[PDB]
Amino acid sequence: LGIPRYRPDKAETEPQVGTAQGLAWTPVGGTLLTIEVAAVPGSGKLSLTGQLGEVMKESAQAALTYLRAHTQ
Amino acid sequence: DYGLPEDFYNKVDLHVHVPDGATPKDGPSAGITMATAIASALSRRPARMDIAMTGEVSLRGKVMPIGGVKEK
Secondary structure, three states: OOOOOOOOOHHHOOOOOOEEEOOEEEOOEEEOOEEEOOOOOOOOOOOOOOOOOHHHHHHHHHHHHHHHHOOO | OOOOOOOOOOOOOOOOOOOOOOOOOOOOOEHHHHHHHHHHHHHOOOOOOOOOOOEEEEOOOEEEOOOOOOOO
């Protein structure tokens, strides 16, 4: 066959800073949505890339709202 | 009356969330819903579910009538 196109076990890559291995069911087979979020000092707002929906932004807002209750 | 601090219009934010983006029923048909929700979340005391609510709020503290009592 040649070269393994994919990692044998996913437990071998690395822990990453802004990586969260999501879960989803794409009608072409399940796959993990590697949602990547980067924090940059500045004005303070939500930059919304990667073709979010309304609900996706609301989920981000909900996560920030909970994280604001407990920050320290 | 509800154990609240003297100043809570400035001292604390209020991130409000509603499961329906638009008006499911036109006008605030759940004014006292938010009254109860905000009172519970600002006095840090729970809100009794299994007892639904509905109405409208006026700034004097009066529950104005609502249409479609049958549907509520």
